[PDB]
């Protein structure tokens, strides 16, 4: 079906978003379990596969608007060098995502491509829930301590 | 069945203390859980749902005793701002309850109305129960410190 | 996640109008039973239920967004004192609730909250379903008479 | 296998009838549905099923005769604006169905196409049935009365 | 409940695009059956049930908006006289519900009719399935030319 | 445990060329999901996971070396424009990666870390096991022709 | 099967190892079990039977080679007073193992003894994992700090 190349521009600027995240939170699932922190590890391997269902679900959704997938541009991950530095750069992440969600979000309903809103709102739905977890995290490092917070993750 | 007019109007008092005590509760609980404190959410959603079941049975008493059930007044919630805090607030809201309950049930035993006293005598039980777990979470707080209560009821 | 304030204020003018429905659909609910008629009194309970249900997706939503849920400001209960004045307070309250509910989606839709967006779709879906209720059963005291209405709705 | 040609135009007006009947009672029945008496909307969706089996049977014979079905000219709906009425409107609609089966089993008798004339029989059989039920209902109207017919129809 | 009438008229013009829908994949479906292309019979067939159940909420949701759903008026069915015509005939069908259904979607916005909208949301995923579906059948015989695309196709 | 720096840089490079597998992989199953060449998407999605499970096991054992994998460098990505391109398009990749694998497993002995080694001899393996399949698929296309193929590789 | 005597000898040397690791470790998980760290008693003495299961294939491997297999003689045990001193030896210990079996590995590899390699090979595979086991308990310590770190190892 012919989409509109906007919508095609947006759907792969959020692609490139995934792409990012699935390789940031891959890459700081493995620290974490590096280090013994296996809960944030699982965690975090969880939240890479929900971003690679995400990818997926975009890469057919450009293909059905005859458009071309971009999985060839990979933007800056963003790492990090301890537990609350790694939460925080997926934070960071999180909300840059969330907002390229909305201003895509506005296209697509703007020229009525109504299923590719659908499909954008049920991935913000889903990244608004791991920013919830990230701010939740950060939170109790605060109020647990960093210690009582990294213990609390060691065992899945 | 026509009732003691003090009886209903003790009986509408207890109701009025439930209906704070579930939003209060159920608010607690809320925070709780925003917070990463997911047992501590948990708990305090039982003993919300606790004074729900309460609630129904004084309605449907003083329904029975042909009197109106106030669902339409509503005391002030005490919610606080930290962990102890709400616990205190609970607590602090339980003990005027139980005062409550203990001048209701005085007045059913002179007017003869045993089944509304077996009643109160058994929110009296559970809330007893209640004011039980507030003081040993406070105690608790004071033994293992904060940041340890506080990691203890981040997991159900 | 910092919400927009205009967005949390509409969310506990829902949630306002959510909390005089459960207080408002219990009395019925109860009130029903204690006359026998247990089939309606079953209904409304659940109708009640179904409220709380939405509360507490409320409440969660305002305290994600980090605003602060209003338990404590309940408005003006509609009982009235017959089936049929009944079912009509509970269609004029859902009214002023779709009202509210649709002009809070406007709201969320301008700033680009689509995800409170989708939760206040969700509970005027169910809000329509409750009035489709309502509605029917005003149409059908008209078609069977009332009497025939009450025997109806005395057993389940 | 070539069929006769009037053989076919008498199937298609058959269909041209059964296609009328599919509407009209699918119709009826999500009227009844939404005023809340769910016994006859249920019934009367199991007859606009029926009526769907006929239509797909009758469309099988004709292609396999290699004349064209007719899915194209839909004949007048007979509505009506209360039980009685819809009920009087699918009974003479059935009158007029049956007639035209009765005509079309004729002809296909007398050019020898005996199984179109056994697949039209088991068709007259169902409607014979669904004239019985309707016969009942009408009669059932006058010795229950209408109130008490429409309450025995407000629940599955 | 009062619906907005401009709303009833798309909705019953989406209701008469299904209309033409169920009875053009129907006979698409018994035609494909009839010459032995047994898997786009079933196909096709699972379409037009799709259809069906569409209209069918459509119907029910202009009842409860207090409209009359139109099953009157049916509309000139694209049929086709190959299987490559047939799937052509099925797309421009297609295409031209999708249009109306978006114009649809902006009248439900613009009057504040959430729950319409949705449901023609949904409506409108199932038809860019079916025209996900269709392009790809028609690029298939192009890849794997007709005499093959047809052998895939004779068993279910 | 600290690994050889030479081990090193030669796991990221085989990982690098696992980052291209995979997305080319991907994007290749889903061109293939789009054309309705389900078979083939089926295969090649199941040859994206496995370079996805190799690049887990590379990155576990660059971090248990004390190494840092590179996820943040993409080459470039092999797609083809028709089936048969993004075969050989697969296989010139897998080429590459054979040969870089084995100059890796030449260091790794030469510092003898044998269990790098038996990592990389594993990975060998599973990327012949897919030359293999390449291979025989572009010989099957000219066995049984295009068209042909193409058709068996239509279904799942 | 007269295996080569220098084979021979370094399958002896490993042995040695595993015979003091088997001692080691026994002692170790005994003293933890003892003073109430019974998560690290279990899987210390998990490692033992590890290292049980190693040293016995290397006897059967030993005898089969028409060597005599040595567990005469015992080696000095690295056993340390606390928990951080025993995760070191025991690393410790590991390391010359490490060592050790990779001097064993290019004798094998230089006399074409391939199958005593390959045994050699899966037993530094096993002993690479308790090093990492290793290096992250040291690096929990670290992380959590050592009360946290033998708090979580109390219970299984
Ligand atoms: C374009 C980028 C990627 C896409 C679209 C993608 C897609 C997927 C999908 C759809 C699944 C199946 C998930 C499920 O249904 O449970 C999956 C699984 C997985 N992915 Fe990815 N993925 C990508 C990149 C990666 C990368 C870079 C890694 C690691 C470096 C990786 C590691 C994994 C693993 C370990 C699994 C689970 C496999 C299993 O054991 O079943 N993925 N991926
Ligand atoms: C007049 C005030 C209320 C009364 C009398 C009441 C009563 C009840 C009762 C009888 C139940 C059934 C519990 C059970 O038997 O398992 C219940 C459940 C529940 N209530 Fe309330 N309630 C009240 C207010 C509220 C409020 C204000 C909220 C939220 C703000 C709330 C949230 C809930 C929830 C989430 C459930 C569980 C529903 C489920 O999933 O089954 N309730 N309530
Ligand atoms: C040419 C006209 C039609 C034909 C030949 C037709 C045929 C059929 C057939 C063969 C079935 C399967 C019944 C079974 O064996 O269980 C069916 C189901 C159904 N039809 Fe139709 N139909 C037609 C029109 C319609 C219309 C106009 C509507 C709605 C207005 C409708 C609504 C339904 C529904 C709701 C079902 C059941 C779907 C389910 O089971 O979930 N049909 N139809
Ligand atoms: C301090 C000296 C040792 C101690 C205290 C010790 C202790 C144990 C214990 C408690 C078990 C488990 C028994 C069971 O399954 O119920 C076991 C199993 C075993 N041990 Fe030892 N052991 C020692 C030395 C050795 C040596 C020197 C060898 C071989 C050279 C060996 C080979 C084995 C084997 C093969 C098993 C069976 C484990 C399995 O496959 O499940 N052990 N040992
Ligand atoms: O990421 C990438 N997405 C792509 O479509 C792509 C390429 N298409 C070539 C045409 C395919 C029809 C070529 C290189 C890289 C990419
Ligand atoms: O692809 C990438 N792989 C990377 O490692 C990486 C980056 N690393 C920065 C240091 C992270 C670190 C800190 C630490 O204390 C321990 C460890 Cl293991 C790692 C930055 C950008 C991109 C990439
Ligand atoms: O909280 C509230 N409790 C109440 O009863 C109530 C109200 N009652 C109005 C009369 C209803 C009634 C009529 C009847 O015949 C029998 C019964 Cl039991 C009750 C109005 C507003 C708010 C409240
Ligand atoms: O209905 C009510 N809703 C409320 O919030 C509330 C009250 N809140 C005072 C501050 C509570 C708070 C502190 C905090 O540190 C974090 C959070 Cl989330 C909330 C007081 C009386 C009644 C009500
Ligand atoms: O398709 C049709 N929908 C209709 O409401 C309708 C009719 N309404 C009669 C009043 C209810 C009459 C004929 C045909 C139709
Ligand atoms: O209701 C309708 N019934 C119809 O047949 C029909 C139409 N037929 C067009 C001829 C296509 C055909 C070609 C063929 O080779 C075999 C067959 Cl059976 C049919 C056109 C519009 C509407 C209708
Ligand atoms: O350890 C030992 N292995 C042996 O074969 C052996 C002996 N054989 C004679 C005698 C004493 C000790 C040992
Ligand atoms: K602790």
């Given at each position: 079906?012919?989409?509109?190349?906007?919508?095609?521009?947006?759907?792969?600027?959020?692609?490139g978003?995934?792409?990012?995240?699935?390789?940031?939170?891959?890459?700081?699932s493995?620290?974490?379990?590096?280090?013994?922190?296996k809960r944030?590890?699982?965690?975090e391997y969880?939240?890479?596969?929900?971003?690679?269902?995400?990818?997926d679900?975009?890469?057919?959704?450009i293909?059905?608007?005859?458009?071309?997938?971009n999985?060839?541009?990979?933007?800056?991950?963003?790492?990090g060098?301890?537990?609350?530095?790694?939460?925080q750069?997926?934070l960071?992440?999180?909300?840059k995502?969330?907002?390229?969600?909305?201003?895509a979000?506005?296209?697509?309903?703007?020229?009525?491509?109504?299923?590719?809103?659908?499909?954008?709102?049920?991935?913000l739905?889903?990244?608004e829930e791991?920013?919830?977890?990230?701010?939740?995290?950060?939170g109790?490092?605060?109020?647990?301590?960093?210690?009582?917070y990294?213990?609390?993750?060691?065992h899945?």
């Amino acid at each position: 079906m012919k989409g509109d190349k906007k919508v095609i521009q947006h759907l792969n600027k959020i692609l490139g978003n995934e792409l990012i995240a699935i390789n940031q939170y891959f890459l700081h699932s493995r620290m974490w379990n590096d280090w013994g922190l296996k809960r944030l590890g699982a965690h975090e391997y969880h939240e890479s596969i929900d971003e690679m269902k995400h990818a997926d679900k975009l890469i057919e959704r450009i293909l059905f608007l005859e458009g071309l997938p971009n999985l060839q541009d990979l933007g800056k991950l963003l790492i990090g060098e301890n537990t609350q530095e790694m939460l925080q750069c997926d934070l960071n992440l999180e909300l840059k995502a969330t907002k390229d969600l909305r201003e895509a979000i506005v296209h697509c309903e703007q020229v009525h491509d109504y299923v590719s809103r659908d499909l954008l709102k049920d991935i913000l739905e889903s990244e608004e829930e791991h920013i919830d977890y990230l701010e939740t995290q950060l939170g109790l490092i605060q109020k647990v301590g960093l210690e009582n917070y990294l213990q609390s993750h060691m065992h899945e």
